[PDB]
PDB file of N, CA and C and ligand atoms in Angstrom:
ATOM      1  N   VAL A 181     -90.060 -96.234 145.619  1.00  0.00           N
ATOM      2  CA  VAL A 181     -90.875 -95.280 144.809  1.00  0.00           C
ATOM      3  C   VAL A 181     -90.567 -93.849 145.312  1.00  0.00           C
ATOM      4  N   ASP A 182     -90.709 -92.834 144.435  1.00  0.00           N
ATOM      5  CA  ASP A 182     -90.311 -91.474 144.758  1.00  0.00           C
ATOM      6  C   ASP A 182     -91.542 -90.656 145.108  1.00  0.00           C
ATOM      7  N   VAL A 183     -91.411 -89.824 146.159  1.00  0.00           N
ATOM      8  CA  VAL A 183     -92.488 -88.871 146.516  1.00  0.00           C
ATOM      9  C   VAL A 183     -91.833 -87.497 146.441  1.00  0.00           C
ATOM     10  N   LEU A 184     -92.324 -86.576 145.628  1.00  0.00           N
ATOM     11  CA  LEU A 184     -91.733 -85.237 145.610  1.00  0.00           C
ATOM     12  C   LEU A 184     -92.199 -84.343 146.769  1.00  0.00           C
ATOM     13  N   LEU A 185     -91.313 -83.478 147.236  1.00  0.00           N
ATOM     14  CA  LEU A 185     -91.671 -82.500 148.289  1.00  0.00           C
ATOM     15  C   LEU A 185     -91.791 -81.140 147.577  1.00  0.00           C
ATOM     16  N   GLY A 186     -93.019 -80.659 147.460  1.00  0.00           N
ATOM     17  CA  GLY A 186     -93.323 -79.477 146.682  1.00  0.00           C
ATOM     18  C   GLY A 186     -93.650 -79.827 145.244  1.00  0.00           C
ATOM     19  N   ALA A 187     -94.690 -79.216 144.758  1.00  0.00           N
ATOM     20  CA  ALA A 187     -95.034 -79.394 143.368  1.00  0.00           C
ATOM     21  C   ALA A 187     -94.243 -78.411 142.470  1.00  0.00           C
ATOM     22  N   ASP A 188     -94.159 -78.753 141.198  1.00  0.00           N
ATOM     23  CA  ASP A 188     -93.442 -77.963 140.242  1.00  0.00           C
ATOM     24  C   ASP A 188     -93.931 -76.515 140.173  1.00  0.00           C
ATOM     25  N   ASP A 189     -95.178 -76.299 140.502  1.00  0.00           N
ATOM     26  CA  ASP A 189     -95.719 -74.955 140.492  1.00  0.00           C
ATOM     27  C   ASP A 189     -95.626 -74.209 141.834  1.00  0.00           C
ATOM     28  N   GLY A 190     -94.898 -74.753 142.772  1.00  0.00           N
ATOM     29  CA  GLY A 190     -94.696 -74.119 144.058  1.00  0.00           C
ATOM     30  C   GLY A 190     -95.673 -74.464 145.166  1.00  0.00           C
ATOM     31  N   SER A 191     -96.624 -75.317 144.816  1.00  0.00           N
ATOM     32  CA  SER A 191     -97.613 -75.764 145.784  1.00  0.00           C
ATOM     33  C   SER A 191     -96.984 -76.576 146.914  1.00  0.00           C
ATOM     34  N   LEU A 192     -97.504 -76.452 148.097  1.00  0.00           N
ATOM     35  CA  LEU A 192     -96.997 -77.188 149.256  1.00  0.00           C
ATOM     36  C   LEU A 192     -97.716 -78.518 149.450  1.00  0.00           C
ATOM     37  N   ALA A 193     -97.299 -79.442 148.655  1.00  0.00           N
ATOM     38  CA  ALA A 193     -97.919 -80.749 148.555  1.00  0.00           C
ATOM     39  C   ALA A 193     -96.845 -81.824 148.504  1.00  0.00           C
ATOM     40  N   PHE A 194     -97.130 -83.010 149.102  1.00  0.00           N
ATOM     41  CA  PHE A 194     -96.422 -84.196 148.714  1.00  0.00           C
ATOM     42  C   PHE A 194     -96.941 -84.671 147.345  1.00  0.00           C
ATOM     43  N   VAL A 195     -96.133 -85.105 146.384  1.00  0.00           N
ATOM     44  CA  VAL A 195     -96.535 -85.591 145.084  1.00  0.00           C
ATOM     45  C   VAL A 195     -96.017 -87.034 144.908  1.00  0.00           C
ATOM     46  N   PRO A 196     -96.856 -88.070 145.048  1.00  0.00           N
ATOM     47  CA  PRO A 196     -98.298 -87.939 145.243  1.00  0.00           C
ATOM     48  C   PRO A 196     -98.726 -87.624 146.689  1.00  0.00           C
ATOM     49  N   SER A 197     -99.965 -87.166 146.860  1.00  0.00           N
ATOM     50  CA  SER A 197    -100.513 -86.982 148.155  1.00  0.00           C
ATOM     51  C   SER A 197    -100.953 -88.292 148.836  1.00  0.00           C
ATOM     52  N   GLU A 198    -101.399 -89.255 148.014  1.00  0.00           N
ATOM     53  CA  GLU A 198    -101.866 -90.560 148.518  1.00  0.00           C
ATOM     54  C   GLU A 198    -101.405 -91.654 147.593  1.00  0.00           C
ATOM     55  N   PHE A 199    -100.926 -92.750 148.167  1.00  0.00           N
ATOM     56  CA  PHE A 199    -100.491 -93.867 147.364  1.00  0.00           C
ATOM     57  C   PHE A 199    -100.374 -95.115 148.258  1.00  0.00           C
ATOM     58  N   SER A 200    -100.193 -96.277 147.580  1.00  0.00           N
ATOM     59  CA  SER A 200    -100.049 -97.541 148.346  1.00  0.00           C
ATOM     60  C   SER A 200     -98.728 -98.174 147.935  1.00  0.00           C
ATOM     61  N   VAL A 201     -98.081 -98.894 148.886  1.00  0.00           N
ATOM     62  CA  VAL A 201     -96.923 -99.705 148.607  1.00  0.00           C
ATOM     63  C   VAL A 201     -96.998-101.034 149.357  1.00  0.00           C
ATOM     64  N   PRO A 202     -96.334-102.053 148.842  1.00  0.00           N
ATOM     65  CA  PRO A 202     -96.149-103.278 149.628  1.00  0.00           C
ATOM     66  C   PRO A 202     -95.241-103.050 150.825  1.00  0.00           C
ATOM     67  N   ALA A 203     -95.520-103.817 151.892  1.00  0.00           N
ATOM     68  CA  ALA A 203     -94.663-103.788 153.096  1.00  0.00           C
ATOM     69  C   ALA A 203     -93.184-103.836 152.721  1.00  0.00           C
ATOM     70  N   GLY A 204     -92.419-102.956 153.329  1.00  0.00           N
ATOM     71  CA  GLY A 204     -90.978-102.914 153.134  1.00  0.00           C
ATOM     72  C   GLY A 204     -90.449-102.226 151.919  1.00  0.00           C
ATOM     73  N   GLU A 205     -91.278-101.816 150.944  1.00  0.00           N
ATOM     74  CA  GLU A 205     -90.766-101.109 149.773  1.00  0.00           C
ATOM     75  C   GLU A 205     -90.116 -99.780 150.142  1.00  0.00           C
ATOM     76  N   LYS A 206     -89.022 -99.433 149.463  1.00  0.00           N
ATOM     77  CA  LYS A 206     -88.447 -98.178 149.867  1.00  0.00           C
ATOM     78  C   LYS A 206     -89.314 -96.985 149.356  1.00  0.00           C
ATOM     79  N   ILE A 207     -89.436 -95.966 150.210  1.00  0.00           N
ATOM     80  CA  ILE A 207     -90.086 -94.707 149.865  1.00  0.00           C
ATOM     81  C   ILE A 207     -88.996 -93.628 149.957  1.00  0.00           C
ATOM     82  N   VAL A 208     -88.723 -92.984 148.838  1.00  0.00           N
ATOM     83  CA  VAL A 208     -87.710 -91.926 148.770  1.00  0.00           C
ATOM     84  C   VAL A 208     -88.388 -90.577 148.614  1.00  0.00           C
ATOM     85  N   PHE A 209     -88.406 -89.791 149.664  1.00  0.00           N
ATOM     86  CA  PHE A 209     -88.927 -88.434 149.576  1.00  0.00           C
ATOM     87  C   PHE A 209     -87.830 -87.555 148.970  1.00  0.00           C
ATOM     88  N   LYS A 210     -88.155 -86.829 147.914  1.00  0.00           N
ATOM     89  CA  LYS A 210     -87.180 -86.082 147.105  1.00  0.00           C
ATOM     90  C   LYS A 210     -87.572 -84.615 147.000  1.00  0.00           C
ATOM     91  N   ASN A 211     -86.722 -83.771 147.560  1.00  0.00           N
ATOM     92  CA  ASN A 211     -86.983 -82.345 147.573  1.00  0.00           C
ATOM     93  C   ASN A 211     -87.059 -81.727 146.180  1.00  0.00           C
ATOM     94  N   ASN A 212     -88.142 -80.998 145.919  1.00  0.00           N
ATOM     95  CA  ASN A 212     -88.457 -80.535 144.568  1.00  0.00           C
ATOM     96  C   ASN A 212     -88.546 -78.990 144.422  1.00  0.00           C
ATOM     97  N   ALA A 213     -89.515 -78.341 145.056  1.00  0.00           N
ATOM     98  CA  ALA A 213     -89.594 -76.920 144.983  1.00  0.00           C
ATOM     99  C   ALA A 213     -90.351 -76.402 146.176  1.00  0.00           C
ATOM    100  N   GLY A 214     -90.274 -75.096 146.430  1.00  0.00           N
ATOM    101  CA  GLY A 214     -91.056 -74.532 147.522  1.00  0.00           C
ATOM    102  C   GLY A 214     -90.534 -74.747 148.935  1.00  0.00           C
ATOM    103  N   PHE A 215     -89.247 -74.707 149.072  1.00  0.00           N
ATOM    104  CA  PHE A 215     -88.497 -75.030 150.284  1.00  0.00           C
ATOM    105  C   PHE A 215     -88.847 -74.089 151.411  1.00  0.00           C
ATOM    106  N   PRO A 216     -88.620 -74.473 152.684  1.00  0.00           N
ATOM    107  CA  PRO A 216     -88.034 -75.756 153.145  1.00  0.00           C
ATOM    108  C   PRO A 216     -89.071 -76.831 153.400  1.00  0.00           C
ATOM    109  N   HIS A 217     -88.632 -78.082 153.339  1.00  0.00           N
ATOM    110  CA  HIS A 217     -89.500 -79.185 153.618  1.00  0.00           C
ATOM    111  C   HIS A 217     -88.806 -80.217 154.531  1.00  0.00           C
ATOM    112  N   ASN A 218     -89.585 -80.988 155.255  1.00  0.00           N
ATOM    113  CA  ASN A 218     -89.075 -82.190 155.863  1.00  0.00           C
ATOM    114  C   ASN A 218     -90.234 -83.236 155.949  1.00  0.00           C
ATOM    115  N   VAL A 219     -89.969 -84.385 156.561  1.00  0.00           N
ATOM    116  CA  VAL A 219     -90.906 -85.506 156.577  1.00  0.00           C
ATOM    117  C   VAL A 219     -90.923 -86.147 157.950  1.00  0.00           C
ATOM    118  N   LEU A 220     -92.125 -86.143 158.583  1.00  0.00           N
ATOM    119  CA  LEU A 220     -92.363 -86.817 159.903  1.00  0.00           C
ATOM    120  C   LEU A 220     -93.631 -87.633 159.753  1.00  0.00           C
ATOM    121  N   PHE A 221     -93.733 -88.655 160.594  1.00  0.00           N
ATOM    122  CA  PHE A 221     -94.999 -89.411 160.661  1.00  0.00           C
ATOM    123  C   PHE A 221     -95.721 -89.038 161.929  1.00  0.00           C
ATOM    124  N   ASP A 222     -97.078 -88.967 161.872  1.00  0.00           N
ATOM    125  CA  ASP A 222     -97.915 -88.519 163.006  1.00  0.00           C
ATOM    126  C   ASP A 222     -98.168 -89.726 163.964  1.00  0.00           C
ATOM    127  N   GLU A 223     -97.667 -89.548 165.180  1.00  0.00           N
ATOM    128  CA  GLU A 223     -97.809 -90.595 166.238  1.00  0.00           C
ATOM    129  C   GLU A 223     -99.260 -90.979 166.476  1.00  0.00           C
ATOM    130  N   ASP A 224    -100.161 -90.094 166.131  1.00  0.00           N
ATOM    131  CA  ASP A 224    -101.564 -90.405 166.309  1.00  0.00           C
ATOM    132  C   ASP A 224    -102.274 -90.960 165.062  1.00  0.00           C
ATOM    133  N   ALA A 225    -101.572 -91.220 163.978  1.00  0.00           N
ATOM    134  CA  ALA A 225    -102.198 -91.666 162.750  1.00  0.00           C
ATOM    135  C   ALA A 225    -101.284 -92.624 161.964  1.00  0.00           C
ATOM    136  N   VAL A 226    -100.794 -93.619 162.706  1.00  0.00           N
ATOM    137  CA  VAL A 226    -100.000 -94.744 162.221  1.00  0.00           C
ATOM    138  C   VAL A 226    -100.522 -96.061 162.852  1.00  0.00           C
ATOM    139  N   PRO A 227    -100.266 -97.202 162.256  1.00  0.00           N
ATOM    140  CA  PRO A 227    -100.708 -98.465 162.852  1.00  0.00           C
ATOM    141  C   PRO A 227    -100.186 -98.654 164.280  1.00  0.00           C
ATOM    142  N   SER A 228    -100.985 -99.347 165.095  1.00  0.00           N
ATOM    143  CA  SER A 228    -100.528 -99.749 166.443  1.00  0.00           C
ATOM    144  C   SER A 228     -99.301-100.698 166.215  1.00  0.00           C
ATOM    145  N   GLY A 229     -98.305-100.378 167.029  1.00  0.00           N
ATOM    146  CA  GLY A 229     -96.990-100.996 166.932  1.00  0.00           C
ATOM    147  C   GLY A 229     -95.901-100.187 166.229  1.00  0.00           C
ATOM    148  N   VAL A 230     -96.301 -99.109 165.579  1.00  0.00           N
ATOM    149  CA  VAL A 230     -95.331 -98.267 164.860  1.00  0.00           C
ATOM    150  C   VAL A 230     -94.723 -97.238 165.798  1.00  0.00           C
ATOM    151  N   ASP A 231     -93.381 -97.121 165.725  1.00  0.00           N
ATOM    152  CA  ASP A 231     -92.590 -96.106 166.394  1.00  0.00           C
ATOM    153  C   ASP A 231     -92.182 -94.986 165.430  1.00  0.00           C
ATOM    154  N   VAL A 232     -92.871 -93.854 165.497  1.00  0.00           N
ATOM    155  CA  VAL A 232     -92.640 -92.817 164.513  1.00  0.00           C
ATOM    156  C   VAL A 232     -91.226 -92.235 164.571  1.00  0.00           C
ATOM    157  N   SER A 233     -90.645 -92.372 165.741  1.00  0.00           N
ATOM    158  CA  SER A 233     -89.323 -91.733 165.918  1.00  0.00           C
ATOM    159  C   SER A 233     -88.302 -92.273 164.928  1.00  0.00           C
ATOM    160  N   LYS A 234     -88.343 -93.541 164.656  1.00  0.00           N
ATOM    161  CA  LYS A 234     -87.362 -94.133 163.763  1.00  0.00           C
ATOM    162  C   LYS A 234     -87.629 -94.002 162.237  1.00  0.00           C
ATOM    163  N   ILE A 235     -88.793 -93.415 161.888  1.00  0.00           N
ATOM    164  CA  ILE A 235     -89.171 -93.182 160.492  1.00  0.00           C
ATOM    165  C   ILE A 235     -89.345 -91.688 160.192  1.00  0.00           C
ATOM    166  N   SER A 236     -88.987 -90.842 161.161  1.00  0.00           N
ATOM    167  CA  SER A 236     -89.266 -89.403 161.071  1.00  0.00           C
ATOM    168  C   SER A 236     -87.926 -88.640 161.121  1.00  0.00           C
ATOM    169  N   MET A 237     -87.864 -87.595 160.291  1.00  0.00           N
ATOM    170  CA  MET A 237     -86.746 -86.632 160.481  1.00  0.00           C
ATOM    171  C   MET A 237     -86.940 -85.819 161.811  1.00  0.00           C
ATOM    172  N   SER A 238     -85.861 -85.221 162.385  1.00  0.00           N
ATOM    173  CA  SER A 238     -86.032 -84.190 163.440  1.00  0.00           C
ATOM    174  C   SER A 238     -86.713 -82.969 162.876  1.00  0.00           C
ATOM    175  N   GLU A 239     -87.591 -82.292 163.639  1.00  0.00           N
ATOM    176  CA  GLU A 239     -88.194 -81.057 163.184  1.00  0.00           C
ATOM    177  C   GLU A 239     -87.113 -80.043 162.827  1.00  0.00           C
ATOM    178  N   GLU A 240     -85.972 -80.155 163.510  1.00  0.00           N
ATOM    179  CA  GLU A 240     -84.903 -79.192 163.354  1.00  0.00           C
ATOM    180  C   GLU A 240     -84.170 -79.446 162.040  1.00  0.00           C
ATOM    181  N   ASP A 241     -84.425 -80.587 161.352  1.00  0.00           N
ATOM    182  CA  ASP A 241     -83.699 -80.934 160.119  1.00  0.00           C
ATOM    183  C   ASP A 241     -84.584 -80.529 158.925  1.00  0.00           C
ATOM    184  N   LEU A 242     -84.126 -79.518 158.197  1.00  0.00           N
ATOM    185  CA  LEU A 242     -84.906 -78.889 157.085  1.00  0.00           C
ATOM    186  C   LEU A 242     -84.152 -79.040 155.788  1.00  0.00           C
ATOM    187  N   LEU A 243     -84.925 -79.486 154.744  1.00  0.00           N
ATOM    188  CA  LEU A 243     -84.349 -79.610 153.365  1.00  0.00           C
ATOM    189  C   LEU A 243     -84.580 -78.372 152.503  1.00  0.00           C
ATOM    190  N   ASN A 244     -83.456 -77.784 152.151  1.00  0.00           N
ATOM    191  CA  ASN A 244     -83.481 -76.482 151.489  1.00  0.00           C
ATOM    192  C   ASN A 244     -82.927 -76.462 150.054  1.00  0.00           C
ATOM    193  N   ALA A 245     -82.709 -77.636 149.456  1.00  0.00           N
ATOM    194  CA  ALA A 245     -82.228 -77.697 148.128  1.00  0.00           C
ATOM    195  C   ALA A 245     -82.810 -78.856 147.355  1.00  0.00           C
ATOM    196  N   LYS A 246     -83.003 -78.604 146.078  1.00  0.00           N
ATOM    197  CA  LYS A 246     -83.573 -79.524 145.117  1.00  0.00           C
ATOM    198  C   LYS A 246     -82.721 -80.806 145.089  1.00  0.00           C
ATOM    199  N   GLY A 247     -83.424 -81.950 145.071  1.00  0.00           N
ATOM    200  CA  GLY A 247     -82.779 -83.246 144.925  1.00  0.00           C
ATOM    201  C   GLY A 247     -82.313 -83.933 146.251  1.00  0.00           C
ATOM    202  N   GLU A 248     -82.351 -83.230 147.363  1.00  0.00           N
ATOM    203  CA  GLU A 248     -82.056 -83.919 148.658  1.00  0.00           C
ATOM    204  C   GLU A 248     -83.152 -84.966 148.932  1.00  0.00           C
ATOM    205  N   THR A 249     -82.762 -86.075 149.547  1.00  0.00           N
ATOM    206  CA  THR A 249     -83.679 -87.175 149.894  1.00  0.00           C
ATOM    207  C   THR A 249     -83.688 -87.615 151.332  1.00  0.00           C
ATOM    208  N   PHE A 250     -84.867 -88.142 151.682  1.00  0.00           N
ATOM    209  CA  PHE A 250     -85.028 -88.841 152.951  1.00  0.00           C
ATOM    210  C   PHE A 250     -85.785 -90.149 152.652  1.00  0.00           C
ATOM    211  N   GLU A 251     -85.183 -91.275 153.024  1.00  0.00           N
ATOM    212  CA  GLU A 251     -85.713 -92.602 152.653  1.00  0.00           C
ATOM    213  C   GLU A 251     -86.155 -93.369 153.915  1.00  0.00           C
ATOM    214  N   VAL A 252     -87.276 -94.026 153.792  1.00  0.00           N
ATOM    215  CA  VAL A 252     -87.773 -94.912 154.821  1.00  0.00           C
ATOM    216  C   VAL A 252     -88.358 -96.163 154.165  1.00  0.00           C
ATOM    217  N   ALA A 253     -88.492 -97.218 154.972  1.00  0.00           N
ATOM    218  CA  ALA A 253     -89.198 -98.462 154.506  1.00  0.00           C
ATOM    219  C   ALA A 253     -90.029 -99.001 155.656  1.00  0.00           C
ATOM    220  N   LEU A 254     -91.336 -99.090 155.366  1.00  0.00           N
ATOM    221  CA  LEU A 254     -92.340 -99.285 156.406  1.00  0.00           C
ATOM    222  C   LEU A 254     -92.698-100.765 156.465  1.00  0.00           C
ATOM    223  N   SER A 255     -92.374-101.438 157.583  1.00  0.00           N
ATOM    224  CA  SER A 255     -92.646-102.862 157.637  1.00  0.00           C
ATOM    225  C   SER A 255     -94.088-103.259 157.885  1.00  0.00           C
ATOM    226  N   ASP A 256     -94.804-102.405 158.612  1.00  0.00           N
ATOM    227  CA  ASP A 256     -96.092-102.808 159.209  1.00  0.00           C
ATOM    228  C   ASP A 256     -97.288-102.375 158.339  1.00  0.00           C
ATOM    229  N   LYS A 257     -98.207-103.298 158.093  1.00  0.00           N
ATOM    230  CA  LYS A 257     -99.316-102.945 157.234  1.00  0.00           C
ATOM    231  C   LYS A 257    -100.292-102.020 157.905  1.00  0.00           C
ATOM    232  N   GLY A 258    -100.912-101.176 157.017  1.00  0.00           N
ATOM    233  CA  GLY A 258    -101.944-100.220 157.404  1.00  0.00           C
ATOM    234  C   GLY A 258    -101.697 -98.807 156.941  1.00  0.00           C
ATOM    235  N   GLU A 259    -102.390 -97.859 157.530  1.00  0.00           N
ATOM    236  CA  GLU A 259    -102.404 -96.488 157.069  1.00  0.00           C
ATOM    237  C   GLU A 259    -101.455 -95.585 157.869  1.00  0.00           C
ATOM    238  N   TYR A 260    -100.640 -94.811 157.147  1.00  0.00           N
ATOM    239  CA  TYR A 260     -99.738 -93.854 157.814  1.00  0.00           C
ATOM    240  C   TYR A 260    -100.006 -92.464 157.266  1.00  0.00           C
ATOM    241  N   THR A 261    -100.013 -91.493 158.157  1.00  0.00           N
ATOM    242  CA  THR A 261    -100.042 -90.087 157.734  1.00  0.00           C
ATOM    243  C   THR A 261     -98.634 -89.505 157.957  1.00  0.00           C
ATOM    244  N   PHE A 262     -98.110 -88.924 156.894  1.00  0.00           N
ATOM    245  CA  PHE A 262     -96.886 -88.172 156.968  1.00  0.00           C
ATOM    246  C   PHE A 262     -97.140 -86.662 156.743  1.00  0.00           C
ATOM    247  N   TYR A 263     -96.254 -85.807 157.276  1.00  0.00           N
ATOM    248  CA  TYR A 263     -96.432 -84.397 157.156  1.00  0.00           C
ATOM    249  C   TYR A 263     -95.095 -83.685 157.132  1.00  0.00           C
ATOM    250  N   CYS A 264     -95.162 -82.453 156.663  1.00  0.00           N
ATOM    251  CA  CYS A 264     -94.038 -81.598 156.632  1.00  0.00           C
ATOM    252  C   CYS A 264     -94.162 -80.624 157.809  1.00  0.00           C
ATOM    253  N   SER A 265     -93.134 -80.555 158.635  1.00  0.00           N
ATOM    254  CA  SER A 265     -93.219 -79.798 159.865  1.00  0.00           C
ATOM    255  C   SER A 265     -93.467 -78.281 159.642  1.00  0.00           C
ATOM    256  N   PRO A 266     -92.720 -77.632 158.767  1.00  0.00           N
ATOM    257  CA  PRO A 266     -92.967 -76.210 158.561  1.00  0.00           C
ATOM    258  C   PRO A 266     -94.304 -75.980 157.889  1.00  0.00           C
ATOM    259  N   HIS A 267     -94.772 -76.922 157.105  1.00  0.00           N
ATOM    260  CA  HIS A 267     -95.953 -76.696 156.275  1.00  0.00           C
ATOM    261  C   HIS A 267     -97.185 -77.467 156.717  1.00  0.00           C
ATOM    262  N   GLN A 268     -97.126 -78.015 157.924  1.00  0.00           N
ATOM    263  CA  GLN A 268     -98.217 -78.814 158.468  1.00  0.00           C
ATOM    264  C   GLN A 268     -99.546 -78.022 158.407  1.00  0.00           C
ATOM    265  N   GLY A 269     -99.487 -76.762 158.702  1.00  0.00           N
ATOM    266  CA  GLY A 269    -100.716 -76.001 158.793  1.00  0.00           C
ATOM    267  C   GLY A 269    -101.180 -75.406 157.476  1.00  0.00           C
ATOM    268  N   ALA A 270    -100.398 -75.621 156.451  1.00  0.00           N
ATOM    269  CA  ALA A 270    -100.785 -75.273 155.109  1.00  0.00           C
ATOM    270  C   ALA A 270    -101.320 -76.450 154.292  1.00  0.00           C
ATOM    271  N   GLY A 271    -101.473 -77.592 154.935  1.00  0.00           N
ATOM    272  CA  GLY A 271    -102.060 -78.729 154.258  1.00  0.00           C
ATOM    273  C   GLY A 271    -101.067 -79.680 153.621  1.00  0.00           C
ATOM    274  N   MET A 272     -99.801 -79.557 153.948  1.00  0.00           N
ATOM    275  CA  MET A 272     -98.812 -80.437 153.383  1.00  0.00           C
ATOM    276  C   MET A 272     -98.695 -81.691 154.229  1.00  0.00           C
ATOM    277  N   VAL A 273     -99.596 -82.593 153.886  1.00  0.00           N
ATOM    278  CA  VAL A 273     -99.872 -83.812 154.590  1.00  0.00           C
ATOM    279  C   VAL A 273    -100.169 -84.851 153.502  1.00  0.00           C
ATOM    280  N   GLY A 274     -99.816 -86.102 153.741  1.00  0.00           N
ATOM    281  CA  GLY A 274    -100.109 -87.189 152.824  1.00  0.00           C
ATOM    282  C   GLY A 274    -100.333 -88.501 153.554  1.00  0.00           C
ATOM    283  N   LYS A 275    -100.800 -89.490 152.806  1.00  0.00           N
ATOM    284  CA  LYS A 275    -101.236 -90.760 153.415  1.00  0.00           C
ATOM    285  C   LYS A 275    -100.624 -91.833 152.555  1.00  0.00           C
ATOM    286  N   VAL A 276     -99.996 -92.811 153.245  1.00  0.00           N
ATOM    287  CA  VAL A 276     -99.521 -94.000 152.512  1.00  0.00           C
ATOM    288  C   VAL A 276    -100.163 -95.223 153.144  1.00  0.00           C
ATOM    289  N   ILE A 277    -100.584 -96.087 152.215  1.00  0.00           N
ATOM    290  CA  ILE A 277    -101.226 -97.371 152.592  1.00  0.00           C
ATOM    291  C   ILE A 277    -100.180 -98.408 152.405  1.00  0.00           C
ATOM    292  N   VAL A 278     -99.808 -99.174 153.485  1.00  0.00           N
ATOM    293  CA  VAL A 278     -98.780-100.221 153.300  1.00  0.00           C
ATOM    294  C   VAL A 278     -99.599-101.522 153.294  1.00  0.00           C
ATOM    295  N   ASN A 279     -99.444-102.288 152.250  1.00  0.00           N
ATOM    296  CA  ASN A 279    -100.221-103.502 152.021  1.00  0.00           C
ATOM    297  C   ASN A 279     -99.414-104.775 151.752  1.00  0.00           C
TER     298      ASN A 279
HETATM  299 CU1  LIG B 365     -93.081 -78.517 153.200  1.00  0.00          CU
END
């Protein structure tokens, strides 16, 4: 399933902000507008047993063009918070429920 980075109107949002997927489904984050963006998972807001390092971009890796993607597939059930490193403090945060 596709998650946009930036809304069409320039808002600093993941689109959608909240959604659910079955365990293992691919999640494709797709750069849209309002650059730069990236995608990390918060070590303090993922299921016990999850290693964020292997599902997170480097903070130093920034997406600056429309249509670039970052794909992950989450094996473990429960709630994950993802965020954009440059825009963390502007509210560009989202939640995925893996079921
Ligand atoms: Cu961003």
